Amino acid sequence: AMKKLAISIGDINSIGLEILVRSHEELSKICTPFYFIHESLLNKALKLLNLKLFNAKIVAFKDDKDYEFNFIKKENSLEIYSFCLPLGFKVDENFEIQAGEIDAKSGLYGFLSFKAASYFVYEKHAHALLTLPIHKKAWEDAGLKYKGHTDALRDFFKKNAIMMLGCKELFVGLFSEHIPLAKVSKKITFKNLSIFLKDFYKETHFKKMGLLGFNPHAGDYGVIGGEEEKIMEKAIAFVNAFLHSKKDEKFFKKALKDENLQKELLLNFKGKGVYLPYPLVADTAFTKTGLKNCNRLVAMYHDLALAPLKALYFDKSINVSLNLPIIRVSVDHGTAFDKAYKNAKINTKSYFEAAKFAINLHSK
Amino acid sequence: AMKKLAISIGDINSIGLEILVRSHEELSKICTPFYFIHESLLNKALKLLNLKLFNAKIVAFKDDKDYEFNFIKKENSLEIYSFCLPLGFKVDENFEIQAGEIDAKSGLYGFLSFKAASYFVYEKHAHALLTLPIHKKAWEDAGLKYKGHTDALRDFFKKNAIMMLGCKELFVGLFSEHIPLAKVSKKITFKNLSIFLKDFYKETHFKKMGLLGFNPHAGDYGVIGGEEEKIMEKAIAFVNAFLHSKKDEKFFKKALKDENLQKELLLNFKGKGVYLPYPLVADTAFTKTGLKNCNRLVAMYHDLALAPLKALYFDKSINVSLNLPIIRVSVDHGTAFDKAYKNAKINTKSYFEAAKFAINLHSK
Ligand code: NI
Ligand code: NI
After folding, report:
1. Contact status, residue B274 vs residue B201, Cβ threshold 8 Å
2. Which of A15, B107, B261, B299 is least surrounded by CB atoms within 10 angstroms?
3. Alpha carbon of residue A152 to chain centroid
């Protein structure tokens, strides 16, 4: 029944640790969590929060040339493990907590917690990775070249993750993420969109998915631009027909370049496909009746997803990195970074959602 | 105590009539509706709907050189009036209703109903205008040159309407509407945005408004584009200052062209203005707490407004045309156009809200 969940602690100067601790008792009832944190630091946060922690497994990570994972000892109802791995940085746990502040020390430490946990999951010691949020500016101050988890995951695993946001009532894949909105149009090409729609299906197996119009009213039958939507349509038909045919990546790469071959594929395609054939109008897409028609969406750009999504599911909304060799989930900071260790009230709903999501998937 | 409310019937072949008729008893309790429809066509609708209509005021309208507004007879508890005016086309009520169909004759009729109702309001015979939806394609087939209400209202009154969607919980002004999204960026200029925000304020008097970022995360301090946001800031700072100064239109046109004049205004009228100084992040803007912070917003593009607002306020959300010599409101098509006169369930909640909003306004 119990799957091992690897949890990287994020920036210790934020509300990450509080979430972790307050949630521990309920979380241990649904999976076995391993927390990537050394005891000395764990205790600094505990004392500062004035909370206690029972029956938890923590993993002290260290830089070594080889992989090695061992149970070491029990202590204060605490189970301590070590994981040695090639990190490329010397772990330094001896610094103080500085509530809500940007700091090179805790920056590097959290980057390392995450790197250690990611490879822990990659080596199959746990079933999935959950990352608590980090502050990119402390990474920057630590002299790291990465811009966030995704960038680091691309470097570790050489794959470009697909982001999917939301929860059971509504998930949305993002064709593009943190790029300026004036750049998104030229990125919507037949080649790129086809690869994305193929990978997104393979990664999720959703049975009925819909693309959101890029233009108002999905272009309104060509009167409000509509050029992007023609491309979307062409990509849907071709992906639909290709998934139905059960042919391989080699055929795909070849057919992406040959219209006559795409055409042959479309003429032989005798199914309803997995993607709706025509882009959705955003006006209708996030209403109750819209959501009942389709609740697995693909958005060409960041805000089309975020605005409606956070208006409905502020609490339970998770971030899911698809297309990597590990299952990785996350949550959004949500509050102000700087406003932490102050008994400010906290929402642990999304932490639980993200966990249950990962637990529910099949082994990679 | 009641104000007079002109109501144009939209496309008689759609659900407009039924809304009008199902709503009349309850509406007459808050205002005095004047419906713009000839008797013989009203009856064809009543019959086809199989409903009756009690103590309702209807205004037949006619092409003519002069503006004249007359009472004529009472009938089936049905006060019939005359309104003659320079319409441009010969009115023609002699046509049969075609349930849910595009037709030149109900299209042309519906345009004429609206033109009459609009001038009725301008010539002060009523307080406000409420337009029931039309179908742009029936307008096209009738040979009209206009693409919609706003298009025509610009021609009637030589003013560019500013559009505002929502309800008392949330209003969004639209800096652009049905233009291709790839084209929105170039349209965000200091000149155009300042005029917009000046007119938006003058028209609404809202004491606290926010602009929503164009780029994800409001450009994240210049890391995700940010160019558009610099321009927002520059406009916000200038308009705010102009509005405190109490200076006039002539000055404003002069100060738009001259950086030093702008600096002088900014030095003299520093201070919190009616616009928040920084664009808002769309992630946070539509949540409980966000809305509690600010609930009067301005969006740079159509879908940023439509998608979260229809997720929250599907039933109650209205359309308001600001910046015209008359008050004019409207609602969006509930159902598909196709499904009129079927006995499908019909939502009247926004019709009421729209009327409620107009009454609750001062005269013009
Ligand atoms: Ni984001
Ligand atoms: Ni629209």
Report:
1. yes
2. B261
3. 12
Q: Which residues contact A118 (CB under 8 A, 6 or more apart)?
A: A6, A8, A129, A152, A153, A156, A326, A328
DSSP class of B155: H
Q: How many residues does chain A have?
A: 364
Contact B2, B32 (CB under 8 A): yes
B183 vs A contacts (CB less than 8 Å): 225
**Chain B positions in Cβ-Cβ contact with residue A285 (cut-off 8 Å):** 307
CA of B189 to the centre of ligand 2 (A): 22
Cα(B302) to ligand 2 centroid in Å equals 7
CATH of the domain at A210: 3.40.718.10
Distance to chain B for A148, nearest Cα, Å: 13
Q: Does B176 touch chain A (CB under 8 A)?
A: no
B209: three-class secondary structure by DSSP: strand
- Phi, psi at B311, each rounded to 5°: -70, -35
Residue B272, helix vs strand vs coil = coil
Resolution in angstroms for this experimental structure? 2.6
Residue in A closest to B317 by C-alpha = A283
A312: tokens are: 């409905």
Please identify which residue in the block is written with the tokens 């297309």: A323
- C-alpha B147/C-alpha B17 separation (Å) is 22
Ligand sitting nearest the alpha carbon of A306 = 1
Question: Which domain covers residue A167, as residue numbers?
Answer: 1-364
Angle (deg, nearest 10), helices A227-245 and A259-267 = 60
Closest partner residue to A311 (CB to CB) among B219, B302, B312 is: B312
Technique that determined the structure: X-ray
Q: Give the N- to C-terminal CA distance of chain A in Å, as an integer.
A: 17
Domain count, chain A: 1
Residue carrying structure tokens 């103080």: A96
Cα(A110)–Cα(A305) distance, rounded to whole angstroms? 28
Does residue A143 belong to the interface with chain B, where contact is any CB pair within 8 Å?
A: no
Chain A contact present for B179, CB below 8 A = yes
Q: Which residues from B are below 8 Å from A311, CB to CB?
A: 286-287, 308, 311-312
Beta strands (DSSP E) in chain B are 4-8, 32-36, 56-63, 68-73, 78-85, 128-131, 162-167, 170-174, 210-211, 296-299, 318-322, 328-330
* A282–B180 CB contact, under 8 Å: no
Under DSSP, is residue A254 helix (H, G, I), strand (E, B) or coil? helix
Do residues B166 and B330 touch, judged by C-beta distance below 8 A?
no
Distance CA B113, CA B272 (A): 45
In the sheet that holds B128-131, the strands lie side by side as B68-73, B78-85, B56-63, B32-36, B4-8, B128-131, B328-330, B318-322, B162-167, B170-174, B296-299, B210-211
CA distance A130 to B204: 47
How far does residue B122's CA lie from ligand 2's centre (Å)? 26
CA A32/CA A5 separation, integer angstroms: 6
Q: What are the CA-CA distances from residue B97 to residues B44, B59, B76, B132, B334 (Å)?
A: 7, 19, 22, 17, 20
The continuous run of DSSP H or E covering A246 comes out as: none
Longest dimension (CA), chain A: 69
Q: How far apart are CA B36 and CA A126, in angstroms?
A: 71
Which residues of A line the annotated binding site for a divalent metal cation? 178, 217, 302
At A47, which helix (H) or strand (E)? helix A39-49
Nearest-Cα distance to chain A for B291, in Å, is 10
Q: Which residues of B touch A184 (CB under 8 A)?
A: 181-182
* Separation of alpha carbons A112 and A91, rounded Å: 7
Strand order in the sheet with A162-167: A68-74, A78-85, A56-63, A32-36, A4-8, A128-131, A328-330, A318-322, A162-167, A170-174, A296-299, A210-211
What's the Cα-to-Cα distance from A274 to each of A30, A146, A192, A252, A277, rounded to whole Å? 32, 36, 18, 17, 9
* Contact state of A178 with B217 under an 8 Å Cβ cutoff: yes
